[PDB]
Design a protein around this ligand. Structure first.
Ligand SMILES: [Cl-]
Ligand SMILES: [Zn+2]
Ligand SMILES: [Zn+2]
Lengths: 76, 69
């Protein structure tokens, strides 16, 4: 039932009241990976650090760190 | 470490160390660098506001899961 993209926005999202949609992003990557029920990981978008763009694909470093945590969290 | 600094806009998990001058980028990385309790105070970008208990709870929850080996 899970979807193909996820939005995380440090400044505009909430982990409390957000759902990882573009309209209502999560706030954190820790919150996001908690949601991920199966692989493949959805494509995660983050704040663009540029004034020009709202959104930007997660960095490769940030993704790898989230996934490390996710796998280890899948081992109870 | 008594106070950890985390900055999505300006920090780095790669070259940062959680100092106010070299903040971490995420709480994800920050928790990974805490090996003992009690936790340092965590400050996030607003400039700096202390971490919302709403996200601190998540960080301190996932940190306890880690410590089990
Ligand atoms: Cl995070
Ligand atoms: Zn896997
Ligand atoms: Zn404890």
């Amino acid at each position: 039932g899970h979807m193909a993209e996820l939005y995380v926005s440090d400044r505009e999202g909430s982990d409390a009241t957000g759902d990882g949609t573009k309209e209502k992003p999560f706030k954190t990557g820790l919150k996001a990976l908690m949601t991920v029920g199966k692989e493949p990981f959805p494509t995660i978008y983050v704040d663009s650090q540029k004034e020009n763009e709202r959104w930007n694909v997660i960095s490769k470093s940030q993704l790898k760190n989230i996934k490390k945590m996710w796998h280890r969290e899948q081992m109870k």
